[PDB]
Amino acid sequence: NAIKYLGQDYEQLRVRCLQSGTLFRDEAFPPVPQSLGYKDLGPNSSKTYGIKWKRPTELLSNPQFIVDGATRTDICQGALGDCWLLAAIASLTLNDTLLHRVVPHGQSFQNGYAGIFHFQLWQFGEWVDVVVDDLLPIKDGKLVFVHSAEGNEFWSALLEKAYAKVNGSYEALSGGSTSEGFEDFTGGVTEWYELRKAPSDLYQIILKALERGSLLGCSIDISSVLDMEAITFKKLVKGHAYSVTGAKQVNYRGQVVSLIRMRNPWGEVEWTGAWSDSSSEWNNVDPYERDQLRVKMEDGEFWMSFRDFMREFTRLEICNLTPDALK
Ligand SMILES: *[C@@](O)(C(=O)NCc1ccccc1)[C@H](C[C@@H]1CCCNC1=O)NC(=O)[C@H](Cc1ccc(F)cc1)NC(=O)c1cc2ccccc2o1
Ligand SMILES: [Ca+2]
Numbered sequence: 001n002a003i004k005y006l007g008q009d010y011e012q013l014r015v016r017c018l019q020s021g022t023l024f025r026d027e028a029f030p031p032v033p034q035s036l037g038y039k040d041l042g043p044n045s046s047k048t049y050g051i052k053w054k055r056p057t058e059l060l061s062n063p064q065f066i067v068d069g070a071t072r073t074d075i076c077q078g079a080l081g082d083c084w085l086l087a088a089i090a091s092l093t094l095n096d097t098l099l100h101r102v103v104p105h106g107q108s109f110q111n112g113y114a115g116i117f118h119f120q121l122w123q124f125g126e127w128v129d130v131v132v133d134d135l136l137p138i139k140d141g142k143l144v145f146v147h148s149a150e151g152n153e154f155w156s157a158l159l160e161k162a163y164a165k166v167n168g169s170y171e172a173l174s175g176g177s178t179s180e181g182f183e184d185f186t187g188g189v190t191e192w193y194e195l196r197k198a199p200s201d202l203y204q205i206i207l208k209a210l211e212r213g214s215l216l217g218c219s220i221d222i223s224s225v226l227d228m229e230a231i232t233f234k235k236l237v238k239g240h241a242y243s244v245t246g247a248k249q250v251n252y253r254g255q256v257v258s259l260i261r262m263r264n265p266w267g268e269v270e271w272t273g274a275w276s277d278s279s280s281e282w283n284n285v286d287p288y289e290r291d292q293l294r295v296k297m298e299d300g301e302f303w304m305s306f307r308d309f310m311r312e313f314t315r316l317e318i319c320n321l322t323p324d325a326l327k
C-alpha cells in the first residue's frame with residue numbers, strides 16, 4: 001500500500017546487495033557533511049567536530065534492531081534540537097498497530113542483513129516507504145543524535161535518520177512542532193489545547209484519547225528567547241516537547257486524585273514535585289497501585305497530579321487518527 005520514496009525498493013535493493021555480497025550505500029542520502037546540515041551543523045561548524053559515519057556492525061559485536069520491544073525508553077535525545085520529533089516517536093510506541101507500520105519489525109543486523117533498513121512515514125497525505133543505509137553519525141564511539149537506553153539497539157537511531165532523509169538533513173529537524181511528528185507517524189490530525197482555557201472535561205478527554213491510541217504531547221511556554229530550554233526549580237524544561245504517556249485516577253487521602261504521566265525525550269531530568277518517582281505521595285496510595293504505576297528510575301518519565309500539570313504546563317496536543325468517527 002505504501003509508495004516508494006524516490007522509487008527506492010527496499011526488498012529489491014536488499015536482495016541485490018545480498019547477492020553481490022555488498023552493503024547498501026544510499027545514493028539519495030549519503031554519509032557526507034550536507035546530510036548533517038548546512039549551518040549550525042554545516043561543513044565549517046565547530047559542532048561537527050569529530051563526527052564520523054559508522055554502521056552499527058562497524059561499532060559493536062552484536063548490534064540489534066529491536067531489544068525488549070520498540071518502546072519509549074528507546075528514545076533518548078542526542079545533540080540535535082528535535083525534541084518535538086522524539087516526543088512523537090515515544091508517543092507512537094504506545095499505539096501498537098501504528099508502531100508496527102512505521103517501524104517494520106522484521107529487520108535484523110544478522111540474518112538477511114545488507115546494510116539497508118526501511119520505515120513508513122505519512123508524507124503529504126500518503127504513506128511512503130523510506131529506505132536508509134545504516135551509516136549513522138558517531139562521535140567518541142557513540143551515537144551523536146538519538147540513541148536508546150540500550151546501547152546496542154538501533155531502530156530509533158535509524159528512524160530518526162529516515163526522518164532526516166525526507167527533510168534533507170539532520171539540521172532541518174532542529175526546532176519544530178510535535179504535531180508535525182505526530183501526524184507524520186499516524187496520518188491523524190492534531191487538536192491543540194491552551195491549558196489556561198481548557199474544557200472542564202479535559203482529563204476525561206485525555207483518558208479516552210490515550211485509551212484509543214491517539215498521540216499526546218505537552219509543553220511549557222517560553223517568555224523570551226533566554227527562556228528556551230530553561231530548567232525550572234522543579235526540573236521541568238521550558239520550550240521543550242514532552243510525550244503524555246499515561247493517566248490514571250487513584251484513591252488518595254480520602255479522595256480520588258487524577259494523575260497524568262509524561263516523558264521527557266531526554267530520557268532524564270524529571271519533575272521533583274508531588275507524584276515524582278521518590279515523592280512521599282506514593283506512601284498513601286494502595287500498594288498494588290503503587291506497584292503498577294510508580295517506577296523509581298531516572299528515565300525521563302514521571303507522574304504529576306492533573307492539578308499540578310494544569311498549573312505547570314501550558315499546552316497540550318492530541319493527534320487523533322479519526323477524530324470525527326470515534327468509539
Ligand atoms: C527541544 O527542547 C530540544 O530539542 N532540546 C534538546 C536540544 C536543544 C538545543 C540544541 C540541541 C538539543 C527543542 C530546543 C529548541 C530547538 C532549536 C534550538 N534551541 C531550542 O531551544 N525545542 C523545540 O524544538 C520547540 C518544541 C516545542 C514543541 C511544542 C510546543 F508547543 C512548544 C515548543 N520548538 C521550537 O523551538 C521551534 C518550533 C518551530 C516551528 C517552526 C519554526 C521554528 C520553530 O522553533
Ligand atoms: Ca527497546
Ligand SMILES: [Ca+2]
Nearest residue numbers: 297298299301
Ligand atoms: Ca522516572
